[PDB]
Structures are given as C-alpha cells and as structure tokens.
Amino acid sequence: GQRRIDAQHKRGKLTARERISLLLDPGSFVESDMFVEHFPGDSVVTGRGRINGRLVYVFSQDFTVFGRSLSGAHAQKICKIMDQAITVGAPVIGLNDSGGARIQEGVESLAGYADIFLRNVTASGVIPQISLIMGPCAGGAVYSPALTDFTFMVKDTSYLFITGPDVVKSVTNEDVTQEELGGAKTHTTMSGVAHRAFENDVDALCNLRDFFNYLPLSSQDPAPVRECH
Amino acid sequence: YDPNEKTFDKILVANRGEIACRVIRTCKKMGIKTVAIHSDVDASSVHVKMADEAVCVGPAPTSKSYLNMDAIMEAIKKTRAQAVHPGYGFLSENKEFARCLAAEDVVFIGPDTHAIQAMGDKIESKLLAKKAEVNTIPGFDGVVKDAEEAVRIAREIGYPVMIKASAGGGGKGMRIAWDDEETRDGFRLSSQEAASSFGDDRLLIEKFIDNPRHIEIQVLGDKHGNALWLNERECSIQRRNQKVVEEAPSIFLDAETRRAMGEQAVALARAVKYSSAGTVEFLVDSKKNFYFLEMNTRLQVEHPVTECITGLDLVQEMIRVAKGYPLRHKQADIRINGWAVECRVYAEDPYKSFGLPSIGRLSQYQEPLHLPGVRVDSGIQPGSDISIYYDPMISKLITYGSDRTEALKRMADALDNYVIRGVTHNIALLREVIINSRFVKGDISTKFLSDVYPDGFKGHMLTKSEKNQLLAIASSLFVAFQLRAQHFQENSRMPVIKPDIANWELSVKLHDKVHTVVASNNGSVFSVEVDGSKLNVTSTWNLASPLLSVSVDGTQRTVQCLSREAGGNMSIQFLGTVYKVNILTRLAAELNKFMLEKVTEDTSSVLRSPMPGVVVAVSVKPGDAVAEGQEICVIEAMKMQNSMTAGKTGTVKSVHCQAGDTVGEGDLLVELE
Amino acid sequence: DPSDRLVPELDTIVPLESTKAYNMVDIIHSVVDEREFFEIMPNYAKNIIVGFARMNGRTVGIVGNQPKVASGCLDINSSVKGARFVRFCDAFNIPLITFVDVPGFLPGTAQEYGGIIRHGAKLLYAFAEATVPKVTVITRKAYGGAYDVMSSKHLCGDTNYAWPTAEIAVMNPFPAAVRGFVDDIIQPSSTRARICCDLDVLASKKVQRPWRKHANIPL
Ligand SMILES: Nc1ncnc2c1ncn2[C@@H]1O[C@H](COP(=O)(O)OP(=O)(O)OP(=O)(O)O)[C@@H](O)[C@H]1O
Numbered sequence A: 001g002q003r004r005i006d007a008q009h010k011r012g013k014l015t016a017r018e019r020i021s022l023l024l025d026p027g028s029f030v031e032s033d034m035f036v037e038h039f040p041g042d043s044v045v046t047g048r049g050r051i052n053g054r055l056v057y058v059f060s061q062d063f064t065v066f067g068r069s070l071s072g073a074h075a076q077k078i079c080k081i082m083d084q085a086i087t088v089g090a091p092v093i094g095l096n097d098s099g100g101a102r103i104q105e106g107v108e109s110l111a112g113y114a115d116i117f118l119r120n121v122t123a124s125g126v127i128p129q130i131s132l133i134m135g136p137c138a139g140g141a142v143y144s145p146a147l148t149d150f151t152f153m154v155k156d157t158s159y160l161f162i163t164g165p166d167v168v169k170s171v172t173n174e175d176v177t178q179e180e181l182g183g184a185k186t187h188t189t190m191s192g193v194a195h196r197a198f199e200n201d202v203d204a205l206c207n208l209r210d211f212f213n214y215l216p217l218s219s220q221d222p223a224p225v226r227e228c229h
Numbered sequence B: 001y002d003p004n005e006k007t008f009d010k011i012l013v014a015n016r017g018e019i020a021c022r023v024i025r026t027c028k029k030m031g032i033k034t035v036a037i038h039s040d041v042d043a044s045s046v047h048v049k050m051a052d053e054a055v056c057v058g059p060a061p062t063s064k065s066y067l068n069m070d071a072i073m074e075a076i077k078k079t080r081a082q083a084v085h086p087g088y089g090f091l092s093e094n095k096e097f098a099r100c101l102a103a104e105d106v107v108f109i110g111p112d113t114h115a116i117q118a119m120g121d122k123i124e125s126k127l128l129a130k131k132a133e134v135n136t137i138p139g140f141d142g143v144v145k146d147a148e149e150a151v152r153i154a155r156e157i158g159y160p161v162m163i164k165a166s167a168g169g170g171g172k173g174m175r176i177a178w179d180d181e182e183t184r185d186g187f188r189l190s191s192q193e194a195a196s197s198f199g200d201d202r203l204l205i206e207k208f209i210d211n212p213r214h215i216e217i218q219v220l221g222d223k224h225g226n227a228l229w230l231n232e233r234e235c236s237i238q239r240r241n242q243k244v245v246e247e248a249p250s251i252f253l254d255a256e257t258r259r260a261m262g263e264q265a266v267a268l269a270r271a272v273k274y275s276s277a278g279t280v281e282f283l284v285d286s287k288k289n290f291y292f293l294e295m296n297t298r299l300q301v302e303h304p305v306t307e308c309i310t311g312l313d314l315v316q317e318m319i320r321v322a323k324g325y326p327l328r329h330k331q332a333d334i335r336i337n338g339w340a341v342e343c344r345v346y347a348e349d350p351y352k353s354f355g356l357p358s359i360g361r362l363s364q365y366q367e368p369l370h371l372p373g374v375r376v377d378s379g380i381q382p383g384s385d386i387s388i389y390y391d392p393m394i395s396k397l398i399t400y401g402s403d404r405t406e407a408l409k410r411m412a413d414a415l416d417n418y419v420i421r422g423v424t425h426n427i428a429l430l431r432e433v434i435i436n437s438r439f440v441k442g443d444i445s446t447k448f449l450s451d452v453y454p455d456g457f458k459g460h461m462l463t464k465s466e467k468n469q470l471l472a473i474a475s476s477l478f479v480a481f482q483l484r485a486q487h488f489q490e491n492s493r494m495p496v497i498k499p500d501i502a503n504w505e506l507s508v509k510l511h512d513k514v515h516t517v518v519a520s521n522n523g524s525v526f527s528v529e530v531d532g533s534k535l536n537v538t539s540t541w542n543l544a545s546p547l548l549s550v551s552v553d554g555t556q557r558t559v560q561c562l563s564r565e566a567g568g569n570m571s572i573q574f575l576g577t578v579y580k581v582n583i584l585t586r587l588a589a590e591l592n593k594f595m596l597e598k599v600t601e602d603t604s605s606v607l608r609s610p611m612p613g614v615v616v617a618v619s620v621k622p623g624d625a626v627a628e629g630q631e632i633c634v635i636e637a638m639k640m641q642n643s644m645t646a647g648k649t650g651t652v653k654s655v656h657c658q659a660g661d662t663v664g665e666g667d668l669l670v671e672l673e
Numbered sequence C: 001d002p003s004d005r006l007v008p009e010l011d012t013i014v015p016l017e018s019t020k021a022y023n024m025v026d027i028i029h030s031v032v033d034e035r036e037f038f039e040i041m042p043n044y045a046k047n048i049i050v051g052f053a054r055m056n057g058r059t060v061g062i063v064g065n066q067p068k069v070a071s072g073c074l075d076i077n078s079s080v081k082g083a084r085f086v087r088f089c090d091a092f093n094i095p096l097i098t099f100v101d102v103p104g105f106l107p108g109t110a111q112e113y114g115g116i117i118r119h120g121a122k123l124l125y126a127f128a129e130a131t132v133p134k135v136t137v138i139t140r141k142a143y144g145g146a147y148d149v150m151s152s153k154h155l156c157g158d159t160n161y162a163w164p165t166a167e168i169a170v171m172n173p174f175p176a177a178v179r180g181f182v183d184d185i186i187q188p189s190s191t192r193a194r195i196c197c198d199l200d201v202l203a204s205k206k207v208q209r210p211w212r213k214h215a216n217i218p219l
C-alpha cells in the first residue's frame, strides 16, 4: 500500500514500477500477464519496453510491499517473459530485489528457481542477459544472476549470499554482518561475482541504459554501430 | 509336526541371531504366531521380519537391551506373550528372570530355577556329581588355601595338577601346575589374579587329564521325570576354549562306551531332576577314563548335527515339553543315520591368534542351499551389519551324508560354494580342518589346533599339482578378461580390427617365485603350459558370476575371483584360501624389472588396533621398555575379551589410548621403538 | 551381468538417523556392472564422487554426493569437479546417472569470498545444458536449492526416482510425488533393474535448442 511505498522510500529505494519507468523510454512499457494472483501482483512486474528505440524485455521484483514468497506465479511470469524474449530475439534485464520470501523457504519456490535456471542456460549465448541486484537476495535466487552475462550491484543496499549471517554464526561460529558477507564491495572487490557497483538506484539505472546501448540484441545480429564524429 | 496339538499361541523369543530365526521357523512349522524383540541396531535383522510381530526393546548395547529386566517385562505385559524362549546365553541362566516370570502367568521354556542354581556353582556341581555316583575328575576333595597343601596334593595325587579357582565365567583363574616348584610360586600368582579378578579364592585343584576329547550327550528331560539320551556329539576341535567344528557320531566312541555315557548322563540328570533339554559334557581321554566336566542347562549351540543324525527336532520336542505333554520317544526309537559334520562360520580373521574378529557390512552373501546335503542356519542376509555389541558369528553350516567321508566331501563342496563379501570370515581354517589328514583319520584332541599349527594359522599349503592348477586358472581368467575387453559393437564408421594373437606369454608372481606361462585359447578350452607342464582348462567363463567352475584336466574346481586390478593384481580364492597373483605380459615384466621398488618403513616401533571395540585395560605408559610377548592393551569387542602383546622389544614413544576408550580398527594406540 | 539383477543389500544402507552418514561408493559398486568403477579424482573434493562405469555393457558417467565427507555438502572444489565431469560426458554422448543426498551448500565466509555463487552455478549449468540421457536417484536428502542443481526435473533430468527414505524438502517424498517431482518411489533393491531399462528407452533421445556459436558458462 501507500504506507509500504513510503517505507521503501525511507530506506532510499524505489518501487518496482518506478525502477522500470526510469529504465525504459517514456511511454514504452507494455506490461504483460497483469491479472495473475499469487492476492494479485505476484510481487513481480514483467513486460517489454524500448531503450533508445531498441526492444528489451524486463522484470522487476516487488517483494517489499505486496509479496509473501516465491510463489509459482512469480517464477511462471518470469519464465513467460524469458520465453517471449527468446522467441523474438531481444535481451532480458532483470531487477532483483527479493528482500523477503517469508522465512526463505517454499516447496514450489525451488521448482520455479529450477525453471528459471533452465531458461537462463537455454538463453546463454542466444540473447544478452543483464542482472541488476537492487536489494538483498538470498538462497537459491542468487544463482540465476550468476548464470547471466553481466551482474551489477547497488552500494550499501544490495546483498548476495546463499546463507545468511545467522546460519554462518550457528555453524562456523563467526560473527559477520550482511555487508561484509554479501555486500556490493565484497562482490566487486574480492569475490569476482559482480561486475560494477553504483551509488544508488537512479545512477545504476542510468548507467544500465548507457551500458545497454553497447550490446547487440541477439547473437544473430552484428555488433552495433552508432554515429561517429 | 502336528498343528492339531495345542501349544502356546503367542511366544516371545528373548534372544537374537540365527537361534531366533530357528525358533521362529519351528513355531511357524507347528503353526504359532511368534513375536520377537530387538534393540535399535537389530531393527533390520532377519528375525524381526520372520516374526509376525515385533517389540523394540531399547538401546543398542545388549546389557541394557537383551539383559534389561524391566524392558523385557514391559514387553511381556504389553504383548501378552503366552510363552518365553531364551535360546542360549543372555538369559539362559538368569534365575531372577525365572522367578520374576513365575510371579507372572507366562511360561518359560527351559530348565527350572532350582536346577540352574544347583548346577551353576562348580563346587555344588562336583558335590552333587559325586553323590550321584558318577565318575569325576580326580583331584583334591576340598579347597586349598596355602602352598603347603598344594604341594602335598601334587605329591599324593599327581604333579600335573590344575591350579583353578572358582567363578571363572570367562575362563579366568584357570592356570595349571606341573611340578612341585610350580605349586608354590604359581600358587601365589594364581591367588593374586584370583583376588584381583573375583577374590573368593575357592580353589578346585584337580589332576590333569591328557589328550582328551570333549564329547556332548544330548539329554532330553521333562517334568514327567523320565530322561532320554540322544547319541553323542564330538566337539574336540576347539580354539581359545571355544567349539568350532562338531561331528555328532563321534568316531572314537564305541557302543559299550555309548551305553555307559548314556546311562551316566541319564542318572546325573535324574539326580539333578532336570526337566528340559541339555547337554552333558565329558572329557574321555585315550585311556577311556570318562570324567564329568559340566552339564549345560540351556540348548546347545551345535544341536543341529544331532538333529541331523537322529532325524529329530529338538526345538519342537522341548516346546511340547514346556506345553505339558510328556516325552514321546523311546531309547529304541533313537538311532544313528549316517554321519553329519557342522562348522561355525564366524566373522573373524583366522590368521591372527586363531581368530581375531573384524567388523563390517555384508555387501554380498550367498549360501550353497542348492548343493545336496547342506543345511545353513544363519541369522543374516545381504546388507546385514556386524556390530561390536553381539557375538561375531555369520552362520552355521551342517552337512550330512551316508558316511563320514561323504559328509566331509559335501562340507568341502559347500564351503567352496559359499559367498561372503564385506567381512573377513574363517572359511579357510575350517577347510584345512575338514581336509586335515589327522582329522580325516580320527586322531583328534582338544590340543589339536595348538600342535597342528604351533606358530598359528598360515593357510593351505599348495601341492605342486595344485599350484600348477591355480596358475593355469589364473592365467586363463586373465586371458579371458582381455578377450572380452576386445569385444565391441559394430561402429560402421571406424570398424574395429580385432588383433589375431594366438599365444599369450605371461609372467605370474605367486608368493615369491616367478613363473612363465604360455596360454592358448581355442573356443572355450585353454591350453596352458606352466614351466613345461601342460594343462587344459575348460569352463563357461562367465566373468560376472561370483562363483566360477573350471574343469582343469577333468578335475572340477570352483574358484572365486575376489578382486582384479588393471595393474595385474588378482586376489582369487582357491580351496578356501585367498591367493594374490600378479599377472603381467612378458614384455611388461621385462620393462617392470627396471621399476624401482618403493621402500616401506616397516621398522615396527608402532602398534595398531586390530580389535574394533573399547580398550578397557592399558598396561603401558609413554616411556615403557616393553619386551617380546608383553601385553600392551586389552580391548573388549564382539562381547569377547582379547589381550594383545607387543611381540617385540621397544620403548614406548607415546600412548594414544586409555582404559575404557572407544577405538576402531586401524587406529594407532601405542608407539614403540 | 544380467540387467535385471536385484541388489537387496541396498535396502538397509541408508540409516534412519539423518545425522548418521553412509558411503555412496557402496551403492555405486552395487548398482553398476560387475561392481567395476573407474573413479576420477578419488582423493580431491571427496564430498562428491564422479567416475566411469558400465550398465548393460554401455559406458555411463556416475555423479553422486558423499555423506561421509562434509556430510555431503557442496562447495567450490566439488562443484568444479562435478561440472567438468558432466560437461565432458555430455560432449561425447555418455549417459549420466546421479545419486542425490545433498543437504545444501557449505556455509562460511571463506566460501562466499572464494566465489561459491559462480562455482555452484557452474554445476547448475553443466547439469542444465546436458542433452544426453540423465537418470536421477534421490537416496535420502534434497535440502535447499542444491536439489535443483542435481537436475531436479526442470534441468532436463529425464527419469527421477526416490527411495522410500528420500526426504526431498527445502529447509518425506510425498510432497515431491504429489507435485510431480518423481516418476516413482522405488524399492532400493530394484534400482539397477530400473536404470538399465531407462537407458534402453532414452538411447534415442534428441533435443533441439536455439542456435548459438557457444554459451557463456560462468567460468
Ligand atoms: N579340568 C580341565 N582340564 C582340561 N581342560 C579343561 C578342564 N576344564 C575345562 N577345560 C577346557 O575348557 C573347556 C570348557 O571350559 P569351561 O566350561 O570351564 O569354560 P567357561 O568359561 O566356564 O565357559 P563355557 O562353558 O562356555 O566353556 C573344555 O572344553 C576344555 O577345553
């Protein structure tokens, strides 16, 4: 609701739809599979749009406001958008903010993750896949970004790790916070998982548009050529 | 078997292993629902599935599971079992169990409490025996307390007199004296260990009986008074005071002595007022001076051989006795039917101290039930696990024939067709025992293993002909494996050009010598020349079956290829003994002559843990200069106490164990120098 | 070696106590032809087992978890070892048989700093792109996303079976069976007999995938 949106803005983050609006050209977003209930919304916004006039497919996770866990509908929507992108031959950009998912469980969550992994592996080398981690992601959700071509992180706001600090303390008996276990600096300086880290969400989205300008739409296309001066 | 004869519908077997399976199958034969108890470990045993219902007892150790009074009483009252059967051991002589069950309304199948108490004490047993007018072991009629009385007894009866104290459940305080000098210093020593162990110091010194043979007479009694003796049972072959090989119609015993033994056993049973099935143990020597040793009140372990010779079922008869019906047989009805021999396949390594038990899981198990005249009493199955909480036993093998020679031949055939993979058994030792010349002739004594193998068990000594046969079989298997390796499927893109070699020149390294072998193949026949000698080996050459039968020069031999390596190593079981052979091609051997041998630092100075169990007695500390034969550590395992010596002289560098520490196999315990 | 040979020794090899471990090499030896197994890297990353064997005379690749070492948890070295073996087997038309008893990935700061995410994704990728026939047997445990890694159906695992002791979960096999995560619950003694049969059916498996020069495996 509105209170949840205000709470998200208090941390300095945007919601899924504002992220999509900043990323894409104005008046170019076309949402797909709007009416599916996980409660509606499914905590993921999928669709297609254009960057500088070139087609792209996008999904943005929305666990912070109206999402409980990785329902089958969430992964089904993501798989559908990936299948469309394969069919037409256009890149996929995924904004990962899975800061939630109950107690990090779910029987049908792991099957959906397996489906998404299969789609990533099938798309590997066929269409470019870009992953921007804009919030905390944990568990099996961290392998799909690892399977994509490029991974970007937002400083002080995004995390990537399989097991949280609680399990590490319980088993290995050591004290580490979220930042020093899976923070952006950790994964960009001494882990080799992320490729770049950006100051905040607006800066990350602008740099993502600039980066997207470089790439071809699929592997059947030649390298892009802009106008040179 | 008469199902119409009414008998207790619900029976609980307060035991485990093969005896539980035997009781369950007997009750099923007579049509009785049988419940079985088991600890947590034995939840996957054979007998729990063989029983229609199960009642788990509790913790793994037998002391708190199969010896737990409260748990077994809870089981009885919850399952409403009409009868209880203890088998042997465990609660066979538990008198408090007998009285507590008698307090309830459940019948115990076995001896009465009074007989158990009377016969349990060795002194009371001897006293009752000598009132029973049955010849007993000569010796002092009393208890010796000082060296003077001991030397006087040794002088006025006989110098070879045992210095044996009381108790001795595990054979403790069973030392022997042979002259006047021993009867004082050894008397002091034996008093010392008796005080250390139990402390009652009630000695039972008696004259030594040379070259005896332990004979068992099956006495069947009942509450109706009359008792019947069932032939005999020779159990002369013994290692570490434990029976291994038993033949029922003893060869040394003759008809007059048969009648004498039967009459003496029956009279002693009447004196004891025995009302169940038991065995009378006799120590007849070469002079035919029979001496009553002891009478077990429980069912004997080696009863199936008596069952085979007599054509009778002891379990059914004793359960009918427990029901209330009187004995239904006569001495005239009892006779001998041919011959029968039984061995105990144990989970022990016979090379170490005539049996050093091991631990493991049965990855492969097959019995020779198809072989004629073979009976297998086993309480395990493929995937069964051997544990430290119980007896190290695998099975009992019983073979019966029309003559002793036929029974022995069938037993050898069964032992050669018996598959055990996962643990180290002792089938080899049983094989040499049943093919030994003295054993076949009949000249056997209780010291058979001590003098036949003085240094210990070494294995089967191969004859020249047998060695040639073994080399031929190994070479034939090697060539068969290569030939099978050459067989692919059609490719139609790169056709396989099969090599057309006709002769294989191999170097085979058995034991220490190196032999040159020339093998040629023709269909299913291998012509093998070993050092000039020519042999023809023919077989179906199935390389996947565990047992392979070959026809070496007409002689049929069954072999087992236990292991094979790409480097030429092959562990193969011939005549019950595992041999290691290294087969190479001639060129490979010529090139291998240049390989530098890897020097192994086998300078002793160490001591491992052959017994997987609990080290309960440590007699060394870091810095102890031990000597040859000096005991280092005692480990309780397999419900058996074994003491191990250093075997050499060397100062203890460090001790990595303590008294009462759980230590598995292969663990370094005490470093030496 | 008959393809219908029963393996009754496998019916009680998995202990009921989930904390207690067993040896997967015993299972592998019992199932394969003549109990012959060429183990690859036997002394490195011993919490995973890979190797070559034969089923009904046909070469197969064997991948399994080892609960004896590290309780069967996956880590960087085991992931790399398994991924390379699986990729080789797929590249040369060799069928894969997998035995799954994984309780998840190994936690810690060393694993995270070493790049456990990409190294695990290597094994996920290797199992996902394989177009050779794949047979999967879950023995006891499938916690976490590691279950998806061992080609849990959606990574094209052709036939998947579970033992009556398999405990597929996230943090009993009935949830998996109801959702459709196993084709059957098999008795452990029939394993070999099942697998051989499947390898006869799936020998003619053909899959079509989108064209590409090559893929970008997370090396
Ligand atoms: N007086 C004796 N002279 C010689 N050997 C003897 C004598 N008494 C016993 N033995 C040996 O010990 C064996 C039986 O010993 P004994 O019955 O005392 O042992 P235990 O530890 O009380 O238990 P068990 O009845 O199970 O053997 C005999 O078979 C024989 O080998």
Ligand SMILES: [Mg+2]
Binding pocket: B281, B294, B295, B296
């Ligand atoms: Mg006795």
